[PDB]
Amino acid sequence: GEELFTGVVPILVELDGDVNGHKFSVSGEGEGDATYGKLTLKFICTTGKLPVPWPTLVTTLVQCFARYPDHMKQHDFFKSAMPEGYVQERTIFFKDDGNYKTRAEVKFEGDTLVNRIELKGIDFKEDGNILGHKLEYNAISDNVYITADKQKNGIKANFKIRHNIEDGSVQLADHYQQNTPIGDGPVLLPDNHYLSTQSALSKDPNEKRDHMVLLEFVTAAGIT
């Protein structure tokens, strides 16, 4: 499982979304290098204009690429589930606004690590920060707090993302996450720890489609 990540691995992401009945699709390509916790990705809205802010999709759009320090390798659930993969589900509660519910399957297709996602968003405000596009195209950085879930043979996680709003304020997105293996083989059930994650968002100056370029670092921590 871990051996599948010792080099650079191609990534494919495919997302189908429906937020308040606004339907859209995103496709992504890039590479991950778990040795350095490093991800480089480019996403394109294939249906036209994205109806929500790109920053709100970052966490949805492959924590198997986390750098787990040598001394914490027995706590890496994500790679232990490979190549068969895992289901990753979230509910993301946007404070004073709607929620996303996401279901994804993360697995290998040949040599390529694939993340296939369905996203459903409901109860958003038409002129809120999300459907009104009031969030700054700004990096996000925070800690993903992971705990074991023995009853599902997987993990749970929780974290908060504070998205900057255009007026200087913050739009909180409270994340609740569950991962469960797809295969029936043994997986690593971790002690409590976190992934320290930083995502830098940018634009391809030659790209005319609605898109997002990401450079992301992911590092496991919190166990000495």
Residue numbers in the entry: 4 to 64, 68 to 230
What wording appears in the published article?
Fluorescent proteins of the green fluorescent protein family are β-barrel-shaped proteins that contain a fluorescent chromophore formed by the autocatalytic cyclization of three consecutive amino-acid residues and, as such, they provide convenient genetically encoded fluorescent reporters of localization or interaction in cellulo. The sensitivity of fluorescent proteins to specific X-ray-induced radiation damage at cryogenic temperature has been well documented, showing that the conserved glutamate residue close to the chromophore (Glu222 according to the GFP sequence) appears to be specifically affected at relatively low absorbed doses [i.e. ∼0.1, 0.8 and 0.1 MGy for IrisFP, EGFP and mNeonGreen, respectively]. Given the sensitivity of this residue in fluorescent proteins to specific radiation damage, the cyan fluorescent protein Cerulean, which produces well diffracting crystals, was chosen as the first target in the work described here. Cerulean possesses a radiosensitive glutamate residue next to the chromophore, the side chain of which is severely affected by specific radiation damage (decarboxylation) during cryo-MX experiments. To evaluate the characteristic dose at which specific radiation damage occurs at 100 K in crystals of Cerulean, we analysed the evolution of the atomic B factors of the progressively radiolysed carboxylate group of Glu222.
